[PDB]
Amino acid sequence: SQIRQNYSTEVEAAVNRLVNLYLRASYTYLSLGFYFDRDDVALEGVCHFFRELAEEKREGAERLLKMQNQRGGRALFQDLQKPSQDEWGTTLDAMKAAIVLEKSLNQALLDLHALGSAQADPHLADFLESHFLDEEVKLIKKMGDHLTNIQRLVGSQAGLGEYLFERLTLKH
Amino acid sequence: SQIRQNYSTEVEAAVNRLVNLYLRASYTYLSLGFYFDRDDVALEGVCHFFRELAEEKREGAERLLKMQNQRGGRALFQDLQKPSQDEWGTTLDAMKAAIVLEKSLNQALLDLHALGSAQADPHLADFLESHFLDEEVKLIKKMGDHLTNIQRLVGSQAGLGEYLFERLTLKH
Amino acid sequence: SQIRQNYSTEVEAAVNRLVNLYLRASYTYLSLGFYFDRDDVALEGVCHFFRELAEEKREGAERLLKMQNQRGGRALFQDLQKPSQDEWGTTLDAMKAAIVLEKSLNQALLDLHALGSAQADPHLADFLESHFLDEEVKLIKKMGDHLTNIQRLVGSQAGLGEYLFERLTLKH
Amino acid sequence: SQIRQNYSTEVEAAVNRLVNLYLRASYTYLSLGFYFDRDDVALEGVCHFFRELAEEKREGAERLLKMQNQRGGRALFQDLQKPSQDEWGTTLDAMKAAIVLEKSLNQALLDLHALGSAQADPHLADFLESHFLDEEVKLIKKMGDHLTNIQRLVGSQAGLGEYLFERLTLKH
Amino acid sequence: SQIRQNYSTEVEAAVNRLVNLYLRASYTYLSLGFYFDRDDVALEGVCHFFRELAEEKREGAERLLKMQNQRGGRALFQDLQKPSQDEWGTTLDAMKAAIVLEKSLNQALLDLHALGSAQADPHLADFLESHFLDEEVKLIKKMGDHLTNIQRLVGSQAGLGEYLFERLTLKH
């Protein structure tokens, strides 16, 4: 590289780690999506919701990789760990798992922002602020809204509630 | 005929039998459709679902008959047995009956494909692969998805669930 | 599942393995693409070529997963091994690696087709024939064409040849 | 002024200095552009590349001046030093000089951002982040990409390589 | 026939021979075209150039056959000899072979024109003048132009020259 300027080895490494976290999140959402497409689960609104998230997380990883090259850092890829479950339970279980996943991604963004700030790397800080921090806050708010609605629908007729949420809230 | 080539008498007969099975399936779906149009049943999404299937099965029979002539075989028609029931119960009962019917049609397709393969009749094999095997897999997946949704909706309020499935899943 | 018919546990497992191979290929192409976007490599036609392939391989994996559910099999995900190299050398080195990768995917498709045939699973066989086998042959032919052109351009002025191939053959 | 708020004399002075640096960069690019339009140089893609940069740097200076007035600071202009060379050598020499120039502008932006941060001037920090820091990173990446391509094309036929880069990479 | 007038048996036979020569030329160009589509040759501009010529020569044969019937002569077909080579070497070798082939076709046209003139058959003479003689002169000029350009590009970097001619002269 003959372009690198004000780009620490610490940030470079943390960016590579964050790419891995985003790709693993994308993989987790791929698994979630296809689980809800099983004939014995069959909630297509939920399938679509998670498949869209798999695409978003992949796009996030690609934006990070583009930035890594723009700064003169070098992409290094690691194994992608398989998702934490093979079967994901109810829509409620799945949405709970998704919120946990997003909170972990958000903390990783916040940690990287703090590192950039400590390293006086304003381009890195701006990059996260412009493309990641608000997208993450918006997504987590949506998931929280969903969780509340799913929970309200349980009552004593859980199957009915799960059907209605998929039909009337999720896009299909 | 002065066109027949590589077309066994065994395949010719099995094609005629398959036409009968498709026409009988069409007849079964005609009966299912009109049952759901009864004033004391009155589930128009279900009526439309089965009437559409009656049309599909008739079209399948006609494609087979066209192919029979293309190969130089001779169509032979047999009686069409009346459907197995006069009344079809709940949407759940009906969808269960439909899946049983489709699995039987699918096995007949698979048996004919195996016969064609044994007879080194690649045109027959390709014909089934191109126009029948995937259409059948897709349909059975849809029925399985429906069954799962219907079953989830039973709970302790079966009437409510039956109404909601017809309103919110089926086309009307 | 209440839809599974004529779908062996052997094929189900091999489909899961093939999904892993396609996702690993997609990952390899992601790494190839970003390597050619490095400021000290800077061959955008090559970047685009491999990024497009990453998308194609992901789409292939998703088609397999869709089919797995259509048949009533169950998706199981494994770790995605990181790509075999961190740096990919010249366009020639990269295209050689890509051909090796594609030949391995092609052999996996051929092995699965043979398994399906042995198991008298014509839907599986047709599925591969319709969506994978010719796409793979076409891609490998394109790569072979590229390799020949890259090799012709080496001469005694390798840098010049690498630039010209990227400018005049690859899309940019 | 009756509008000035949270705008230090230090930042005000540094903004004036940065305007001077941007105008001097614009002047340098004006000289570069016209050098490549000489009949004995005659590389119009290179002329256009540098003339466009002269416009960009002038626009940057004007944005800074607008901001200075928005904050209630007072523009102060100094002499514009003539560019460091009268003749700019090869496209390679020129692109090397341009990268050196851009790195100096980038460091000046980073220094000003640090000053704004130290002075708790978030409007100034945001201003640089929004209109300058990423534009600079993008430009330097482009120049690095160009340098790599120019360098690859030297080989033993430097004239040929210089022609081809101007024809096939630069806009004309 | 009840239409034949002023149409000698000599011309009729020579027309049949010329049809054979045109069809053999078409066959030769078919072989040339597919040779350049080999993965180890891979010059698609050259493939397209010769495939287009195969079409032109077939069209020429068909025009001759139409004329034969218009005059009341009788088409007689002979074997089409396979092309003179199975592999065609470089673009230069191929273009040299093509020029040799075209000169032979041109001499056959000239010989037939002379025969028509000797037989006081102005319709035949006009037919060749209107549809063949200038088309042939134009084609040979194009081939000569190509040969000169190919030859100029050999230098000490033959592979590079062959690539550049295919990219920058031939349609692709």
Description:
This is part of a larger assembly, with 5 copies of chain A (172 residues). With 172 residues, the first copy, chain A, is mainly α. Chain A has helices at 9-36, 44-71, 91-118, 122-152, 158-168. Chain A has a single domain (1-172), classed as Ferritin (Up-down Bundle), CATH 1.20.1260. Chain A is built from 5 helices and no strands. In chain A, helix 1 (9-36) runs antiparallel to helix 2, helix 1 (9-36) packs antiparallel against helix 3 (91-118) and helix 3 packs antiparallel against helix 4 (122-152). Chain A is elongated, with a radius of gyration of 18 Å. Chain A starts with 8 loop residues before the first helix and ends with a helix. Chains in contact: A-B, A-C, A-D, B-C, C-D, C-E. Chain A binds chain C through residues 1-3, 23, 27, 30-31, 34-35, 37-40, 58, 62, 65-66, 68-69, 72, 74-83, 86, and chain C through 1-3, 23, 27, 30-31, 34-35, 37-40, 58, 62, 65-66, 68-69, 72, 74-83, 86. It is classed as metal binding protein. Keywords: Artificial Metalloprotein, Metal Binding Protein.
